[PDB]
């Protein structure tokens, strides 16, 4: 998905 | 090419009402987060929101939310800012920005693409 | 919530290296993002997950990081870069549900002395 954002490692929505 | 393209500058009385575009062109406009920021002359970059063009999901900086309105019609690629009631403090540049997404073992985002910004004059 | 604290202004003389430090309270757990604004112009971006640079930038900029701490380098510092840098994070707090929130730096203005 493209709708990704990712703030850290292992940390993530959608 | 690959652009977020904004439109003219603006000068309002206070108590008018008004609505900014952000044309996308070159990328797939639906599947990128789209930002929007603000700076008033002579200070830093202020969160405003983001939105997801595919379904309209929004997330508002408490400092703005309700005070602003994000928007897109797909039908033209463009994203939206609409103000109800303009007050002197909405005074500024504002520009709109793509969040890209970066992949890899490390998946993250940033904002890469940037509109020329949009000058906002609220005056009597 | 948190803030992004940078120092106001750094100043240079055209080939020190300039440093850029950029804290806050989750920053270790947090990717950090670098943007170069020129006055007048739009904002360029420099540097994402604390140490890539996208294509383009080039490799005398670096990213770095340790502790709650993201620093920007600029060696071979010379006068274009003059202008304001500003990091960014995101924070997620539930506050239940998902509160989503980019987070931005007051901002950093480089000097350099020539």
């Known amino acids: 998905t493209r709708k990704s954002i990712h703030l850290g490692p292992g940390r993530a929505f959608y | 090419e690959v652009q977020l393209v904004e439109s003219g500058g603006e000068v309002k009385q206070p108590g008018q009402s008004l609505k900014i575009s952000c044309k996308s062109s070159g990328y797939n406009f639906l599947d990128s987060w789209i930002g929007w920021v603000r700076q008033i002359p002579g200070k830093g970059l202020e969160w405003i929101g983001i939105?997801?063009?595919?379904?309209?999901?929004?997330h508002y900086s408490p400092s703005f939310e309700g005070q602003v309105t994000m928007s897109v019609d797909k039908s033209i690629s463009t994203a939206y800012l609409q103000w109800t009631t303009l007050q002197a403090s909405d005074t500024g540049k504002y520009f709109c920005?793509?969040?890209?997404?970066?992949?890899?073992?490390?998946?993250?985002?940033?904002?890469?693409?940037w509109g020329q910004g949009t000058m906002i004059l609220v005056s009597s | 919530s948190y803030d992004l604290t940078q120092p106001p202004s750094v100043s240079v003389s055209p080939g020190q290296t300039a440093s850029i430090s950029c804290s806050g309270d989750?920053?270790?757990?947090?990717?950090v993002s670098w943007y170069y604004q020129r006055p007048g112009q739009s904002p360029v971006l420099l540097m994402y997950?604390?140490?890539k640079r996208p294509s383009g930038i080039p490799e005398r900029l670096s990213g770095s990081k340790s502790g709650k701490t993201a620093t920007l380098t600029i060696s071979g510092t010379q006068s274009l870069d003059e202008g304001d840098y500003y990091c960014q994070a995101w924070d997620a707090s539930t506050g239940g549900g998902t509160k989503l929130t980019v987070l931005f730096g007051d901002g950093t203005r480089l000097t350099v002395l020539g």
């Open positions: 920005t793509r969040l890209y997404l970066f992949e890899g073992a490390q998946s993250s985002n940033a904002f890469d693409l």
């Open positions: 989750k920053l270790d757990d947090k990717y």
């Open positions: 997950q604390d140490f």
């Open positions: 939105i997801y063009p595919d379904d309209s999901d929004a």
